Design an enzyme around this catalytic site. Structure first.
Site, mmCIF file in Angstrom:
data_model
loop_
_atom_site.group_PDB
_atom_site.id
_atom_site.type_symbol
_atom_site.label_atom_id
_atom_site.label_comp_id
_atom_site.label_asym_id
_atom_site.label_seq_id
_atom_site.Cartn_x
_atom_site.Cartn_y
_atom_site.Cartn_z
ATOM 1 N N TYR A 194 -7.843 20.137 14.169
ATOM 2 C CA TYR A 194 -6.610 20.862 13.888
ATOM 3 C C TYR A 194 -6.474 21.059 12.393
ATOM 4 C CZ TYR A 194 -1.834 22.357 15.310
ATOM 5 O OH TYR A 194 -0.705 23.079 15.597
ATOM 6 N N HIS A 242 -5.204 24.019 17.425
ATOM 7 C CA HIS A 242 -3.880 24.587 17.610
ATOM 8 C C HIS A 242 -3.740 25.341 18.944
ATOM 9 C CE1 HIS A 242 -6.491 27.549 15.730
ATOM 10 N NE2 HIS A 242 -5.677 28.516 16.115
ATOM 11 N N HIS A 246 0.673 22.165 25.098
ATOM 12 C CA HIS A 246 1.446 20.938 25.229
ATOM 13 C C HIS A 246 1.879 20.713 26.679
ATOM 14 C CE1 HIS A 246 1.449 21.458 20.881
ATOM 15 N NE2 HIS A 246 1.799 20.188 20.777
ATOM 16 N N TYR A 254 -3.493 13.860 19.723
ATOM 17 C CA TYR A 254 -3.771 14.129 18.313
ATOM 18 C C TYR A 254 -4.149 12.826 17.617
ATOM 19 C CZ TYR A 254 -1.392 18.650 18.779
ATOM 20 O OH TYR A 254 -0.990 19.909 19.162
ATOM 21 N N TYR A 284 3.960 16.788 24.527
ATOM 22 C CA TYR A 284 5.089 17.310 23.797
ATOM 23 C C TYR A 284 5.534 16.186 22.862
ATOM 24 C CZ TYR A 284 5.591 21.047 27.290
ATOM 25 O OH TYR A 284 5.381 22.152 28.076
HETATM 26 MG MG LIG Z 1 1.129 25.947 21.513
#
Ligand SMILES: [Mg+2]
Length: 293
Positions: A194, A242, A246, A254, A284
Site C-alpha cells: 500500500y 488500495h 473492506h 494491513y 473496516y
Molecule cells: Mg476501497
C-alpha cells in the site's frame, strides 16, 4: 534469543574477552558477538528489543565485515558484502522479499537501493546467497513518495506483488474493482503493498470525506493516500494495496512494511490460507468506516 539461540561461553585472557559476549546498543539492540582479545572478531547476531533476529554476520576489529544479513520485521531482508566501514554499500547487495526468493540485486549505498535488478535467490549454502538475474530490464530504485508525487515510475509494477495479486471486478460486493490473489498461499503471507502519497492526519480529518476513499494511516504523523488520478489503475499500478476492499470478515490485514523502493509503507498480509482467485479484503476501521448512516 530466549529459547533457541545457542547461549554461549567466553573466557578471559588477561582481562580481555574471548569467545561469546553480549552488548546492548543505545536503541536497545542486543548484539551477541564473537570476541577475540576484547574486540569483535568473528560471527555475530543482533536482536531487536525482543527476541527477534535483526542481523546475522561477522565482525573484524569491531567493524562488520563480509557478507551480512539484515532482517526486517515484515520478513524482508537486505544481504551483501559490507563496506570496509561495515555499511551496506556496494555493487553486489540485494534486498530480498519475504518469500526469500524474489530479490532486487544491485547497487546500494548505506542500505539504500540505487539500482536493484530483479533476480532470484538461487542458494545460500548457509553463509552467502547466490543470485541469478531475471530475464529482462526490470530495475528499481529507492523512490519514496512525497505529498504530491506518488512515484517516479507510476506504471512500473512491484514484481513481488505482480506474481501474487491482480485487480478485477469484485463479485462478492458492489464496490467496483477488487484485489484478487493469483496463487494459493497460507496465513501470514505478504500479498500486496500500500504505497501512496504522504499526507497529514490534520489534512485528512479537515477535508471533505469524499476525498478519503483511499486513505490509510501509516503512523501517528502520516497518512498514505491514493488520490484521484492515481486511484485509476491506468494512471498508477506500481502497487495495488488500495484496491483491496473492506469487509467485516476480512481474510487479510494491513501491516507495516519496509520496502526498498517505496520506503516505510503498509502491506496486505493474509490472515488465513487464501485460494487462487480469492478476493482479498481488509477489515473496516478508523480510516475506513462501514457503509450506512
Ligand atoms: Mg476501497
Amino acid at each position: 534469543f530466549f529459547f533457541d539461540g545457542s547461549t554461549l561461553e567466553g573466557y578471559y585472557v588477561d582481562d580481555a574477552l574471548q569467545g561469546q559476549g553480549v552488548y546492548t546498543y543505545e536503541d536497545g539492540g542486543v548484539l551477541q558477538g564473537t570476541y577475540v582479545d576484547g574486540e569483535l572478531n568473528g560471527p555475530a547476531q543482533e536482536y531487536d528489543t525482543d527476541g527477534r533476529l535483526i542481523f546475522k554476520g561477522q565482525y573484524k576489529d569491531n567493524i562488520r565485515h563480509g557478507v551480512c544479513w539484515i532482517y526486517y520485521p515484515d520478513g524482508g531482508s537486505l544481504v551483501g558484502e559490507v563496506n570496509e566501514d561495515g555499511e551496506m554499500t556496494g555493487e553486489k547487495i540485494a534486498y530480498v522479499y519475504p518469500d526469500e526468493r524474489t530479490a532486487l540485486y544491485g547497487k546500494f549505498i548505506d542500505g539504500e537501493m540505487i539500482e536493484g535488478k530483479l533476480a532470484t535467490l538461487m542458494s545460500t549454502e548457509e553463509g552467502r546467497p547466490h543470485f541469478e538475474l531475471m530475464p529482462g530490464n526490470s530495475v528499481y530504485h529507492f523512490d519514496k513518495s512525497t505529498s504530491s508525487c506518488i512515484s517516479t515510475n507510476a506504471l512500473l509494477p512491484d514484481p513481488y506483488e505482480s506474481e501474487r495479486v491482480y485487480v478485477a471486478e469484485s463479485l462478492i460486493s458492489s464496490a467496483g474493482e477488487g484485489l484478487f490473489s493469483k496463487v494459493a498461499v497460507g496465513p501470514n503471507t505478504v500479498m500486496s503493498f500500500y504505497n501512496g502519497v504522504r499526507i497529514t492526519h490534520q489534512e485528512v480529518d479537515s477535508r471533505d470525506w469524499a476525498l478519503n476513499g483511499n486513505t490509510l494511516s501509516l503512523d501517528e504523523e502520516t497518512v498514505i493516500d491514493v488520490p484521484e488520478p492515481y486511484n485509476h489503475v491506468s494512471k498508477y499500478c506500481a502497487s495495488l494495496g488500495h484496491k483491496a476492499n473492506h469487509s467485516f470478515t476480512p481474510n487479510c490485514i494491513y501491516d507495516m512494511f519496509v520496502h526498498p523502493r517505496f520506503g516505510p509503507i503498509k502491506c496486505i498480509r493474509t490472515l488465513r490460507a487464501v485460494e487462487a482467485d480469492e478476493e482479498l479484503t481488509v477489515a473496516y476501521g478508523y480510516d475506513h468506516s462501514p457503509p450506512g448512516k
